[PDB]
Design a protein around this ligand. Structure first.
Ligand code: NA
Ligand code: NA
Ligand code: NA
Length: 532
């Protein structure tokens, strides 16, 4: 009955499109949904910019000192991520009322919105730990006003996120024509990722690891099953570099990505190098550059890598370095017209934060995909889930299960590591032209003890996902952020003097404080993180 329809298809589809759109337009230069601004806490990178006071709140995060519950940036990322949840919930409110006879893709669209809701809650959970679960799109103002971030235990909060991805897995198609819409495999991947983070229990009052749960790990293994992934045709790109190039978007490795177009990615506006005039943020560390060094057999220098800086002429190196970090003497993003130098064209801080450039989010300066507004921004997609992460999540789970499948996990690591060894498509002249000694070899498929296998796993993550803003979150997952980050502060202070007085406090700095503005507005319903 035409005049009795509260919501037409067009209007509901517009709500759905709006719920996607906020992922491209809802963030900003100091609050990117990549969360790069927060991964300055890791051993992968430095804040950059003009100096320590250019984003003082982010300097404080970088060194773990002088962070406040009231900091503007902390409240802002909370609010921006909750705005994404609000839009997904608005769409669901209308979708729930639709008649499938009128709107045949009702259930699939519901699944899309639940997936987006899960994406936002997952990132909030990584950042803040103790979060509000806003999963009732039909909630009245009174119920809405009594929401709390301790209604659910830590483990239950992870379960609630998983529940959204589970629905999504159960209801999404295997293949999407419109690639920004998640497919079944993307829900499976994110469900697995949720269970992986859930498995490393923090079931006590503080942020310490209390156990590693096997049932959660079995869910990771279940939802990374290559038979599931095959239904969507997902797999490694032929060459690693293709993950980060405009003409290779939506490939087999792009399990799920945010779609930009010439809607540019303004949230990366600060991370362009100084050669474009601004802003030199998000700078690879010397520690990360050194982590690409390899031994005479093509393996990581597990205990010695960081003792001397990478030296092109003499050292074996992983090709992934040259897709991750732009270094002095080399082309910027594969463009021989822009050779990086140790000078003020390649530093906004006279060298304080060094001369490395993060390549992954940057494009060829001649790209038609690159525009200048207030800042320079491109249409390069942001991949939330790369297939390499599926394989390495699977390996991690298998290694933690330690139930006779560590050799299977090594085989998985080797699919990623072998791919890196061959990844010279746009850098194949670097031996002849620059003296680069490429050497990466897969591991022998023999019996490894669990701790050795886990070391190999962590190391493969390090070189696979440098500068992709999950390194800090991994260290917290693993319960070792204080030790790894404090050791990095000690070693990196001789290279970047911003770390002189750095120091991480365990059972405090594993997460951001819940923002005070939020606590205050909740009238006692929100609880602060341990140690804050
Ligand atoms: Na850092
Ligand atoms: Na690349
Ligand atoms: Na630079």
């Amino acid at each position: 009955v035409t005049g009795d329809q509260i919501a037409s298809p067009e209007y509901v589809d517009n709500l759905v499109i709006s719920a996607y759109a906020i992922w491209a337009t809802g963030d900003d230069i100091n609050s990117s949904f990549s969360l790069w601004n927060y991964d300055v806490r890791s051993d992968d990178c430095y804040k950059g910019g003009s100096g320590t006071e250019d984003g003082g709140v982010f300097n404080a995060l970088e060194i773990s000192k002088g962070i406040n519950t009231t900091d503007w940036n902390i409240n802002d990322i909370w609010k921006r991520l909750y705005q994404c949840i609000t839009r997904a919930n608005t769409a669901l409110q209308s979708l729930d009322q639709m008649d499938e006879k009128t709107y045949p893709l009702k259930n699939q669209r519901i699944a899309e919105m639940r997936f987006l809701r899960g994406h936002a809650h997952f990132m909030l959970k990584q950042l803040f730990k103790k979060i509000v679960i806003v999963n009732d799109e039909n909630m009245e103002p009174d119920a809405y006003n009594e929401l709390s971030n301790t209604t659910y235990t830590n483990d239950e909060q992870w379960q609630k996120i998983a529940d959204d991805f589970q629905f999504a897995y159960d209801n999404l198609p295997e293949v999407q024509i419109e690639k920004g819409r998640p497919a079944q495999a993307a829900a499976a991947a994110y469900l697995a990722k949720t269970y992986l983070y859930k498995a490393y229990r923090q079931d006590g009052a503080d942020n310490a690891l209390t156990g590693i749960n096997e049932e959660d790990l079995k869910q990771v293994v279940k939802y990374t099953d290559p038979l599931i992934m095959a239904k969507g045709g997902y797999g490694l790109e032929t060459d690693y570099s293709m993950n980060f190039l405009p003409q290779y978007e939506n490939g087999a490795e792009s399990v799920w990505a945010i779609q930009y177009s010439i809607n540019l990615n303004w949230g990366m506006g600060l991370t362009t190098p100084q050669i474009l005039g601004c802003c030199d943020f998000h700078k690879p560390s010397q520690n990360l550059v050194n982590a690409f060094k390899t031994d005479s057999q093509g393996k990581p220098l597990f205990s010695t890598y960081d003792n001397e800086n990478y030296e092109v002429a003499t050292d074996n190196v992983d090709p992934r370095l040259f897709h991750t970090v732009g270094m002095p003497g080399f082309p910027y993003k594969y463009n021989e017209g822009y050779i990086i130098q140790k000078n003020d064209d390649w530093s906004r801080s006279k060298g304080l934060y060094g001369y490395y450039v993060s390549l992954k989010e940057n494009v060829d300066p001649d790209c038609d995909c690159l525009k200048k507004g207030s800042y320079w921004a491109s249409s390069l997609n942001h991949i939330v889930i790369r297939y390499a992460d599926v394989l390495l999540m699977r390996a991690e789970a298998l290694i933690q299960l330690n139930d006779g499948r560590i050799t299977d996990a090594i085989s998985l690591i080797n699919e990623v590591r072998s791919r890196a060894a061959g990844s010279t498509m746009l850098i194949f002249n670097y031996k002849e032209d620059y003296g680069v000694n490429f050497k990466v070899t897969p591991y022998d498929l023999k019996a490894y003890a669990q701790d050795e296998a886990m070391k190999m796993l962590k190391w493969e993550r390090r070189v696979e996902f440098g500068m992709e803003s999950s390194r800090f979150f991994d260290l917290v997952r693993w319960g070792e952020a204080k030790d790894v980050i404090n050791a990095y502060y000690v070693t990196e202070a001789s290279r970047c003097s911003i770390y002189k007085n750095a120091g991480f406090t365990e059972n405090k700095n594993e997460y951001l404080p819940v923002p005070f503005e939020q606590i205050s507005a909740s009238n006692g319903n929100y609880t602060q993180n341990f140690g804050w």
